[PDB]
Design a protein around this ligand. Structure first.
Ligand SMILES: COCC(CCO[C@H]1CC[C@@]2(C)C(=CC[C@H]3[C@@H]4C[C@@H]5O[C@]6(CC[C@@H](C)CO6)[C@@H](C)[C@@H]5[C@@]4(C)CC[C@@H]32)C1)COC
Ligand SMILES: NC1=N[C@H](O)[C@H]2[C@H]3O[C@]4(O)O[C@@H]([C@@H](O)[C@@]2(N1)[C@@H]4O)[C@]3(O)CO
Ligand SMILES: *[C@@H]1O[C@H](CO)[C@@H](O)[C@H](O)[C@H]1NC(C)=O
Ligand SMILES: *[C@@H]1O[C@H](CO)[C@@H](O)[C@H](O)[C@H]1NC(C)=O
Ligand SMILES: *[C@@H]1O[C@H](CO)[C@@H](O)[C@H](O)[C@H]1NC(C)=O
Ligand SMILES: *[C@@H]1O[C@H](CO)[C@@H](O)[C@H](O)[C@H]1NC(C)=O
Ligand SMILES: *[C@@H]1O[C@H](CO)[C@@H](O)[C@H](O)[C@H]1NC(C)=O
Ligand SMILES: *[C@@H]1O[C@H](CO)[C@@H](O)[C@H](O)[C@H]1NC(C)=O
Ligand SMILES: *[C@@H]1O[C@H](CO)[C@@H](O)[C@H](O)[C@H]1NC(C)=O
Ligand SMILES: *[C@@H]1O[C@H](CO)[C@@H](O)[C@H](O)[C@H]1NC(C)=O
Ligand SMILES: *[C@@H]1O[C@H](CO)[C@@H](O)[C@H](O)[C@H]1NC(C)=O
Length: 1151
């Protein structure tokens, strides 16, 4: 029959090509918002094609009872699904959802089985997850524990608001209040929102706690607890769901700076210990436990798979001879490499307001420089025939660019304004043959595009599917978020396809929240959370699998002088002298923390400092001189540890020699004294842990300068592109009084119109703080987009680039989001891959040199590791239980049963769920039932210990898990007892909660027997000393940068991220600000006030106490402080990741 012909038609590749074309046509047609009704054919033709494909399959391998053949393969289930859904829907619709268009999106996941590579990858991305199992359960366990702790500590503590004062009236029957307007009912008032105060600058409402360490309210405002939680109600810690989402955002580090700042501004600055604990414990150890598990697997499958894979005639010549003769000369190569360098430099000299001299030469520069290349190609064309000239993989390269460039310059009236110039740019890549690191950077782009080019295809398919699903589900709704005043919807919407692609990308780049929040207000919470969080788990898994993979691939492929010297050697050998020095170093360092804006007026201390200042230097000088004698000039000048102390004491001596003698406080001499900030640095030598860490970091310096260099050139391409695109297009008019937002483009469109309507001086043409005007000014902005912090203001201004020297417009240049999309993959994803690989390699080799020994670890810490590891590498053997007394001879058998263990372990889960039910604003009846139950529970538990103690005299204690337990119950028995004792105690709300929190300890009791957590948590215990050595280095570094910040960044305007409680006006406020920045969080808000010197935006001549005048921060030093810190912090936190990853690969791999 035709079945045998159906099999023939089944095996052809034309069938697969037709199926792929139909699927791609469907994908293109599905991305259209208001589909047109011409679709009588298409929805129907497709349905015909997809029915025909299933017909071909069932005719060839269908028949009857096909458990063995058709439909057995899991993928064909999708196909049948598609056909049934299709017909049912196309038939009629009566009282249904009718938004079942989203079901068609599933038709496009059929590409997976056809393109052959896709099916296997989506097969193995799925098997990866199966290995991240424990990690996902510990994630849930730790998230629940921290959610309970946050619930108890900040129960309803996010609602506090500064509200206008009220009085009670006493002329009306119920609670009545007044403030120029009588308002019936307290709650009618504590609710209305014209009675709350707007935080300066932001549009929020102030959050104000009553504790001393917390926000204080303005004069006419009392600070209470009434109203609706910030950010529309999704941030409060009132309920366990809201204390789980708001703490999972802390795990993923999404806008955690906003919650940190609001939480503390209501509960107090001491409560920053909780945040630190969440950020270290979870964001770091957890995220990394997952990356290591995802990695443990990729290697395993590739290792098994690779292993299993193993298992003219007169004269053309005399001068043709000549043409080659010039071409191959070694010096012919030098002229060339160098001419490349000059071009990049010549190019990177465009700027915003070039004087015409800089401009004409810039043109007279390209001609010469492109020309040199024309001679290189023609000579190289005359050298050999075109058969041999278009090969080897680097002649073609050159050939195209040379060709493209010549092309455009020719019209002279040529239209492309910029790329046209930057076509030349790619030449920079040519330095590759010479540069191993640029060669490695190119090989990675190539690998991802071509070889493991199936993973990126899978990622693109997933992103497309998620974008179309989100658009279809949520597009209709976002029309309300539209301001009907301006018909302006959000900048992030999902109404159209592109706008959607971007929300899906943002979610990939880390920024998922501000969007659930803006979609849960138009769409209803249940779905928004379901979809916008679905993109996350899958996506971050795919983006990570592609990344880990690219990396792995590169890896796979008088005679008394001689005794006077010894008598001063012995004082060095005497412990007491240098210990004095060590203490003197700490004290010396500390005394820096007291110089705040208020020391000027703390007289009794100001002076104390100075006596000490002097003595401090002397104790040291006596020490430098003592050393020079004891070890001589050789050892002191050759160790490079004494060199740092030498420079520090040099500048310290210059300070007092110029000041006291010279009576000179003029010019930069005081600026030299802002460098006493480094007195902390004396310490790095002294403490061994900080020392092994700094040695490990120094050993990696040569590679880091190369990796930092390639980025610098690569971002040079992006920076010159950005300068060429957005030069002079970031300036916007502002009416000042009315506000900080550009005026409309219809009212004022050109700068010539901006400065022609200033009859009343309110209009200021102010550029964006971070913009594209210089090549160097470009690189900051790129640091903001590449770190993802502050990038939104740059992206919102580039898209509005209406043109040169003219007002911005709302979305004139929408597609420039593409530039930003391109930089981020190459600039953030690929450059980072190189960074991580090289760091790992240097590290890998160092470990080998000192074989069997991690870096980041002292000698004494070694021996701990050695014993600690031994304890849990071997299980205990020989329990030896004894009946003992007949009195307990029938109790000890019951206490040891497995049934007893599981019922206890499930009573702990019952306690867990009865804990999860708390909430703010609970009725007396609820509060009441719940507390009685808490008493019941303590009781069962006290008892359990008791029977466990029946005759288990010695072994209750030696279990080391049982011993942990007594403590828990005692804390608990006390806890209940301590309950009514608080009455004679001050500040009653916060003493209580903390003792309540001991209840969580039971929660921690579940893991005696849950092995998965036990190995995984044990690991941290083995890694704890390494993290510590690095931590001290982070701290010493924070102090040094904190002192530097208070030196210059005090008295800066308070706007953006410098606000009253987080400012650089003292030590505590300075160190709080650094804590956010150490995670690169919110670092543009900190810096924007610094980079502000201006008649608008700041004010010259404010009168200031200590710093004496000026209210405007300095950009030149501020840009250096933050930019240097972001990098110093990056390299130090990255160091930690390796410490865990290798060590988690030391506990798991070992077993
Ligand atoms: C060759 O023999 C050496 C061997 C171990 C070598 O295997 C390596 C495989 C890659 C892997 C898992 C390793 C260490 C760091 C891991 C990285 C930490 C980074 O952290 C992240 C997340 C946070 C971001 C800031 C960027 O960096 C990831 C992208 C990066 C990461 C997860 C990419 C994958 C890396 C181990 C030792 O055997 C005993
Ligand atoms: N996860 C985020 N980290 C950034 O610190 C935040 C700042 O920068 C940014 O561009 O806009 C605001 C906020 O949305 C940000 N989101 C964006 O990155 C911001 O508060 C001020 O700009
Ligand atoms: C109640 O009314 C009396 C009238 O004499 C007034 O003096 C008193 O202050 C009022 N009390 C309150 C609660 O305001
Ligand atoms: C309380 O309000 C009621 C309703 O208007 C009013 O009738 C009554 O007089 C009030 N109480 C007094 C005694 O003022
Ligand atoms: C408002 O009442 C508060 C209550 O603490 C009080 O401190 C403040 O002085 C009052 N404001 C004015 C201006 O009276
Ligand atoms: C602050 O204190 C006042 C007086 O104790 C009290 O009325 C108010 O409830 C408190 N508000 C807050 C912020 O809890
Ligand atoms: C600026 O705003 C003020 C106050 O609204 C208004 O009166 C003034 O005309 C505005 N100036 C311009 C030209 O925008
Ligand atoms: C600018 O004003 C014009 C009318 O003056 C208005 O049509 C336009 O929408 C305004 N632009 C915006 C979006 O502010
Ligand atoms: C800017 O636009 C105005 C019209 O709004 C026009 O008259 C003016 O001459 C233009 N100036 C420039 C920069 O060409
Ligand atoms: C507007 O005119 C005032 C005159 O006081 C001036 O200070 C302000 O800078 C002007 N703005 C511009 C950009 O001309
Ligand atoms: C807010 O602005 C007012 C203006 O009077 C200022 O005095 C106040 O200190 C500012 N508060 C903060 C914290 O920005």
């Amino acid at each position: 029959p035709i079945r045998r012909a159906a099999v023939k038609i089944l095996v052809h590749s034309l069938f697969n090509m037709l199926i792929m074309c139909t699927i791609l046509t469907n994908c293109v047609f599905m991305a259209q918002h208001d589909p047109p009704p011409w679709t009588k054919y298409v929805e129907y033709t497709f349905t015909a094609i997809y029915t025909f494909e299933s017909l071909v399959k069932i005719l060839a391998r269908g028949f009857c009872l096909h458990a063995f053949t058709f439909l057995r393969d899991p993928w064909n289930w999708l196909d049948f699904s598609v056909i049934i859904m299709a017909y049912t829907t196309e038939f009629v619709d009566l009282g249904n959802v009718s938004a079942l268009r989203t079901f068609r999106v599933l038709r496009a996941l059929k590409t997976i089985s056809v393109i052959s590579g896709l099916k296997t990858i989506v097969g193995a991305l799925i098997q990866s997850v199966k290995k991240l199992a424990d990690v996902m359960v510990l994630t849930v366990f730790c998230l629940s524990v921290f959610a309970l702790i946050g619930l108890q500590l900040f129960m309803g503590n996010l609602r506090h608001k500064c509200v206008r004062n009220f009085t009670a009236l006493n002329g009306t029957n119920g609670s009545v209040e007044a403030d120029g307007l009588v308002w019936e009912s307290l709650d009618l008032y504590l609710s209305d929102p014209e009675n709350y105060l707007l935080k300066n600058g932001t549009s929020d409402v102030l959050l104000c706690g009553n504790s001393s360490d917390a926000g204080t309210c303005p004069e006419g405002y009392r600070c209470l607890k009434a109203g609706e939680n910030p950010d529309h109600g999704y941030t409060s810690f009132d309920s366990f769901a809201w204390a789980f989402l708001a703490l999972f955002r802390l795990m993923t580090q999404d806008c955690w700076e906003r919650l940190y700042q609001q939480t503390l501004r209501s509960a107090g600055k001491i409560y920053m210990i909780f945040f630190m604990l969440v950020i270290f414990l979870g964001s770091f150890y957890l995220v990394n436990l997952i990356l290591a598990v995802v990695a443990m697997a990729y290697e395993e499958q590739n290792q098994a798979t690779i292993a299993e894979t193993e298992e003219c005639c007169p004269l053309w010549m005399s001068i043709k001879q000549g043409v080659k003769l010039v071409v191959m000369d070694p010096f012919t190569d030098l002229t060339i490499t160098m001419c490349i360098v000059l071009n990049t430099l010549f190019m990177a000299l465009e700027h915003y307001n070039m004087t015409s001299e800089f401009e004409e030469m810039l043109q007279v520069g390209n001609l010469v420089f492109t020309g040199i290349f024309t001679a290189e190609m023609t000579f190289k064309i005359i050298a050999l025939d075109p058969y041999y000239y278009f090969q080897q993989g680097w002649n073609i390269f050159d050939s195209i660019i040379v060709i493209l460039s010549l092309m455009e310059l020719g019209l002279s009236r040529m239209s492309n304004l910029s790329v046209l110039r930057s076509f030349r740019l790619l030449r920079v890549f040519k330095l590759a043959k010479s540069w191993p690191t640029l060669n490695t950077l190119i090989k990675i782009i190539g690998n991802s595009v071509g070889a493991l080019g199936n993973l990126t295809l899978v990622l693109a398919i997933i992103v497309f599917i998620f974008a179309v699903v989100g658009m279809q589900l949520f597009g209709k709704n976002y029309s309300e978020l539209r301001d009907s005043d301006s018909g302006l919807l959000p900048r992030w919407h999902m109404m159209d396809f592109f706008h959607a692609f971007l929300i899906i990308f943002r979610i990939l780049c880390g920024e998922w929240i501000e969007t659930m929040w803006d979609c849960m207000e138009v769409s209803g919470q249940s779905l928004c959370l379901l979809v916008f969080l679905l993109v996350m788990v899958i996506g971050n898994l795919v983006v990570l699998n592609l990344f880990l993979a690219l990396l792995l691939s590169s890896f796979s492929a008088g005679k008394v002088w001689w005794r006077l010297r010894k008598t001063c050697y012995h004082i060095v050998e005497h412990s007491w002298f240098e210990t004095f020095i060590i203490f003197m170093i700490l004290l010396s360092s500390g005394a820096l923390a007291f110089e705040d804006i208020y020391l000027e007026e703390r007289k009794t201390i100001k002076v104390l400092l100075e006596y000490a200042d002097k003595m401090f230097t002397y104790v040291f000088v006596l020490e430098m001189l003592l050393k020079w004698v004891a070890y001589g000039f050789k050892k002191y000048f050759t160790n490079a540890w004494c060199w740092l102390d030498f420079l520090i004491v040099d500048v310290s001596l210059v300070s007092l020699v110029a000041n006291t003698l010279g009576f000179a406080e003029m010019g930069p001499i005081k600026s030299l004294r802002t460098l006493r900030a480094l007195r902390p640095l004396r310490a790095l030598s002294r403490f061994e842990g900080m020392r092994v860490v700094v040695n490990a970091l120094v050993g990696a310096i040569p590679s880091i300068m190369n990796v930092l260099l390639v980025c610098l050139i690569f971002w040079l391409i992006f920076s010159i592109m950005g300068v060429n695109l957005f030069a002079g297009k970031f300036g916007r008019c502002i009416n000042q009084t009315e506000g900080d937002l550009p005026l409309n483009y219809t009212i004022v469109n050109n700068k010539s119109q901006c400065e022609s309507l200033n009859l009343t001086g309110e209009l200021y043409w102010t550029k964006v703080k971070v913009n594209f005007d210089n090549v160097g000014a470009g690189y900051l902005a790129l640091l903001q987009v590449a770190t993802f912090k502050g990038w939104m203001d740059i992206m919102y201004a580039a898209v509005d680039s209406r043109g040169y020297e003219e007002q911005p417009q709302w979305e004139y240049n929408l597609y420039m989001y593409i530039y930003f999309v391109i930089f981020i993959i190459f600039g953030s994803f690929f450059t980072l891959n190189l960074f991580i690989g090289v760091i790992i390699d240097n590290f890998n080799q160092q470990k080998k040199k000192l074989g069997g020994q991690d870096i980041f670890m002292t000698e004494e810490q070694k021996k701990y590791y050695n014993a600690m590891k031994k304890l849990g590498s071997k299980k205990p053997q020989k329990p030896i239980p004894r009946p003992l007394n007949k009195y307990q001879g029938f109790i000890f058998d019951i206490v040891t049963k497995q049934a007893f263990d599981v019922t206890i372990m499930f009573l702990i889960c019952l306690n867990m769920v009865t804990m999860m039910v708390e909430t703010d604003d609970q009725s007396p009846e609820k509060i009441n039932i719940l507390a009685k139950i808490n008493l019941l529970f303590v009781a069962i538990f006290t008892g359990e210990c008791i029977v466990k103690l029946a005759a288990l005299r010695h072994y209750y204690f030696t279990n080391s898990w049982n011993i942990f337990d007594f403590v828990v119950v005692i804390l608990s028995i006390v806890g209940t007892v301590l309950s009514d004792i608080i009455q004679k105690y001050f500040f009653s709300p916060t003493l209580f909660r903390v003792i309540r929190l001991a209840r969580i300890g039971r929660i921690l009791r579940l893991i005696r027997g849950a092995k998965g957590i036990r190995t995984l948590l044990f690991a941290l215990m083995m890694s704890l000393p390494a993290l510590f050595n690095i931590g001290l280095l982070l701290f010493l570094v924070m102090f040094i940068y904190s002192i530097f910040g208070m030196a210059n960044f005090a008295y800066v305007k308070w706007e953006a991220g410098i606000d009253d409680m987080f400012n650089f006006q003292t030590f505590a406020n300075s160190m709080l600000c650094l804590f956010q920045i150490t995670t690169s969080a919110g670092w543009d808000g900190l810096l924007s006030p610094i980079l502000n010197t201006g008649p608008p935006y700041c004010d010259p001549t404010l009168p200031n106490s200590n710093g004496s005048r000026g209210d405007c921060g300095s950009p030149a030093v501020g840009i250096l402080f933050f930019t240097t810190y972001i990098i110093i912090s990056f390299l130090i936190v990255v160091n930690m990741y390796i410490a865990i990853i290798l060590e988690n690969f030391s506990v798991a791999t070992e077993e």
